[PDB]
Design a protein around this ligand. Structure first.
Ligand SMILES: Nc1ncnc2c1ncn2[C@@H]1O[C@H](COP(=O)(O)OP(=O)(O)O)[C@@H](O)[C@H]1O
Ligand SMILES: [Mg+2]
Lengths: 457, 315
């Protein structure tokens, strides 16, 4: 049998080459050749000495890393399940190393049912290890393999659906890593919380990301990461507005956060981050309907937001810009829709026919129909349900807003009627609101076939 | 719609039988299974037949201004280098690749179409260890990608050259491929490891104004090795005895892929390679796909994963 000095120099040569062949034409082939040379050197052809048992365990681990170097683990799978069978017949760490290689081999089997069953038995072994029956008192390497098998059970959890289970256990992995670049892990935890509805541990991990960036530890990609932290701050404010719609200090902290956001957004470029800028700024300037005069002030403020967006995006124009600006002019169209509602409110509650007032509101109306005509150029006249909503909106804009000479209203309702006919022979599918514009088109066809014959003469 | 055009390198335990050019029969070990595609090129088809039918039809339709997305792709031993670059420089028409044939065909279309004007843009890039390299200058290394407000996505450090004719394109392409030979002596050990992208972007003026753009990619991605290619409906399993800091960073970003929701904003912080490709897949152009492939006896399971990737391209 192999004595102590010989097995130590065999261990040293094996680990030395297996960890020097990864730093960096056929070096890994000769590396596999020398590892199978060590496999020939072992001589494959309490009770007894248990040092031979821990030796056979660690060289079967070396056989497993040899087989994953070959990526032909089948005979390695059979020899490793024989080794873990004879180890299951009988302990401190041989069981946990066998469990790591066992999870690795059934992971490389690449079938979800048997891998997940062997991984639930792995969870049984993990809690049987965590019942509490060198580098630092036999705890440090145990800690790093605890990170190893916790991340691999997170991997088998995300192989299934298991959303809350993988989220709770990935929380456990990041908290175990935080026992002794992590803001993006807290970002994904809070993004899971955005996909869910509970939002207290979301705020707790925002504060955790803030304190681990304030205490990062120093003897970079952070700009976009804290940018997404601003994004999820205003998404938490969006969720608050959702639960309050479908107080003042929330808007104040949102304003301070979006100003600091704006600063760290315009610092770091960029192309698509400005799409995120107009997205969340239009969100926080659209949903915050709580007053009248400051409502007009924030409407003028988001008109200023799109006005500083505009004069370099007109030069931009990808086809990708046609897509994303179709969504942006869709948002600006909804902004002009509830600003039209605000206009009829302030026309009911204030003397509208003053000259600068009617000039400003027909300027906004002609800008709204100009952007609607731009949406018409988005369809090549020479997935579609927002286009039906835009058809509803251009039909209402063709119906109501005209204060000029009553001659374009009939041809405008005729164009919306033939567009409605085009939809009902192009899709034959139910709309969401266009039955209201159907009966509205019927009654407006009746009234503009009746009344201009009496008022235009 | 997606037109998948697909070339197969002659394997000479193929286990493949071909009933027609559209459909292949793949005998497998559990059970055989038939795979149908739009266009599958076989052993017996020539370089000129694929060039003429596939490449000439798609390059003609590309001349209208749509970016038909021609690309070479494959695993190790896929047959890309022979058909596009050629094995060595030793003017030999069949042995030199389809790329100068595309050059002479495009400049034939240019001078028979020529009534700023029709403008050529060509660029060679290779990506090793997630770093941009240009073969024109050795100093050109680690240059950063940027999508400009032109709609032209480009490498910031790179400088393009205009080319008047296919002979100067052969001189520049042979100089870049010779820099690939010298680069094979350099830190670019394997073509499997690097991501070598030659792109051809062809500009046109209407008459003098409006700009028409076609893209011709020569991509040399990861090969048959099993470390990369970010998403897989096979092994979504990061496999490695490494430091769980980096393993957990990838575990985080795949956990974000869990945290989509039940309207995919396609990821751009994933990889710069797929951003330089995300201008193409899901782009606003015709979805013309020239793709090179090779089925393999040895990694039969991974070539089943590539055939499933071809069905994923079909859907
Ligand atoms: N269509 C083909 N006909 C004959 N031999 C080919 C063909 N395609 C590739 N080969 C040969 O196969 C080998 C590997 O091809 P290569 O293009 O280098 O694959 P890859 O580019 O994926 O490494 C080369 O020696 C090449 O000459
Ligand atoms: Mg190659």
């Amino acid at each position: 049998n192999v004595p102590w000095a010989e097995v130590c120099e065999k261990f040293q040569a094996a680990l030395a080459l297996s960890r020097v062949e990864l730093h960096k034409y056929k070096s890994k082939y000769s590396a596999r050749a020398l590892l199978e040379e060590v496999k020939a050197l072992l001589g494959p052809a309490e009770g007894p000495v248990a040092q031979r048992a821990v030796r056979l365990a660690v060289i079967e681990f070396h056989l497993g890393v040899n087989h994953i170097d070959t990526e032909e683990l089948s005979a390695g799978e059979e020899h490793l399940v024989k080794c873990l069978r004879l180890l299951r017949r009988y302990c401190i760490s041989l069981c946990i190393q066998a469990q790591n290689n066992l999870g690795i081999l059934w992971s490389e089997r690449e079938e979800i049912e048997t891998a997940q069953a062997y991984l639930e038995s792995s969870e049984a072994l993990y809690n049987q290890y965590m019942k509490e029956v060198t580098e630092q008192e036999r705890s440090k390497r145990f800690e790093k393999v605890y990170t190893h098998n916790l991340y691999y059970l997170a991997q088998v959890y995300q192989h299934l659906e298991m959303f809350e289970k993988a989220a709770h256990y990935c929380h456990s992995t990041l908290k175990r890593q935080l026992e002794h670049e992590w803001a993006i892990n807290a970002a994904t935890l809070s993004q899971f919380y955005i996909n869910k509805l509970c939002f207290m541990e979301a705020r707790h991990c925002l504060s955790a990301a803030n304190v681990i960036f304030g205490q990062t530890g120093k003897i970079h990609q952070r700009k976009g990461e804290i940018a997404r932290c601003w994004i999820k701050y205003c998404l938490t404010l969006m969720q608050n507005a959702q639960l309050s719609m479908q107080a003042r200090e929330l808007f104040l902290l949102g304003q301070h956060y979006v100003f600091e956001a704006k600063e760290f957004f315009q610092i770091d470029g960029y192309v698509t981050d400005h799409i995120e800028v107009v997205q969340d700024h239009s969100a926080l300037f659209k949903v915050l309907a709580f007053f009248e005069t400051d409502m007009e002030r924030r409407c003028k403020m988001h008109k200023r937001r799109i006005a500083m967006l505009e004069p370099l995006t007109v030069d931009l124009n990808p086809q990708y810009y046609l897509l994303v600006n179709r969504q942006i002019q869709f948002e600006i169209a909804h902004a002009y829709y509830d600003m039209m509602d605000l206009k009829v409110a302030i026309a009911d509650r204030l003397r509208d026919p003053d000259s600068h007032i009617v000039k400003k509101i027909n300027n906004l109306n002609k800008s709204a129909l100009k952007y609607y005509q731009l949406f018409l150029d988005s369809l090549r006249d020479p997935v579609l349900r927002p286009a039906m909503l835009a058809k509803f909106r251009v039909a209402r804009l063709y119906g109501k807003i005209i204060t000029a000479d009553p001659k374009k209203e009939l041809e405008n309702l005729a164009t919306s009627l033939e567009h409605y006919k085009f939809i009902v022979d192009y899709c034959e599918k139910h709309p969401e609101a266009a039955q209201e514009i159907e009966v509205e088109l019927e009654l407006s066809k009746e009234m503009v076939s009746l009344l201009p014959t009496k008022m235009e003469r | 719609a997606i037109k998948v055009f697909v070339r197969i390198r002659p394997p000479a335990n193929l286990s493949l039988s071909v009933l027609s050019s559209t459909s292949l029969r793949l005998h497998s070990n559990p059970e055989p299974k038939t795979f149908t595609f739009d266009h599958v090129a076989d052993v017996d088809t020539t370089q000129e037949s694929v060039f003429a039918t596939v490449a000439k039809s798609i390059v003609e339709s590309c001349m209208s201004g749509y970016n038909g997305t021609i690309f070479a792709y494959g695993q190790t031993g896929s047959g890309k280098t022979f058909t596009m670059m050629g094995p060595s420089e030793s003017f030999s028409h069949n042995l030199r690749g389809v790329i100068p044939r595309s050059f002479e065909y495009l400049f034939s279309l240019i001078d028979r179409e020529k009534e700023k004007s029709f403008l050529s843009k060509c660029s060679f890039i290779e990506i090793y260890n997630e770093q941009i390299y240009d073969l024109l200058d050795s100093a050109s290394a680690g240059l950063y990608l940027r999508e400009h407000i032109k709609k032209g996505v480009f490498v910031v450090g790179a400088v393009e050259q205009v080319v008047t004719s296919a002979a100067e394109a052969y001189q520049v392409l042979s100089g870049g491929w010779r820099n690939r030979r010298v680069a094979s002596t350099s830190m670019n050990r394997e073509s499997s490891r690097s991501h070598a992208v030659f792109t051809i972007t062809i500009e046109s003026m209407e008459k003098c104004v409006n700009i028409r753009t076609s893209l011709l990619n020569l991509v040399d991605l990861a090969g048959s090795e099993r470390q990369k290619d970010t998403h897989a409906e096979g092994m979504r399993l990061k496999e490695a005895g490494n430091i769980n800091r980096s393993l957990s960073t990838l575990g985080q970003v795949i956990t974000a892929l869990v945290d989509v929701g039940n309207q995919r904003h396609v990821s751009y912080r994933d990889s710069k390679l797929t951003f330089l490709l995300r201008d193409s897949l899901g782009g606003n152009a015709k979805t013309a796909i020239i793709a090179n492939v090779h089925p393999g006896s040895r990694s039969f399971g991974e070539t089943l994963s590539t055939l499933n990737f071809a069905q994923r391209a079909k859907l």
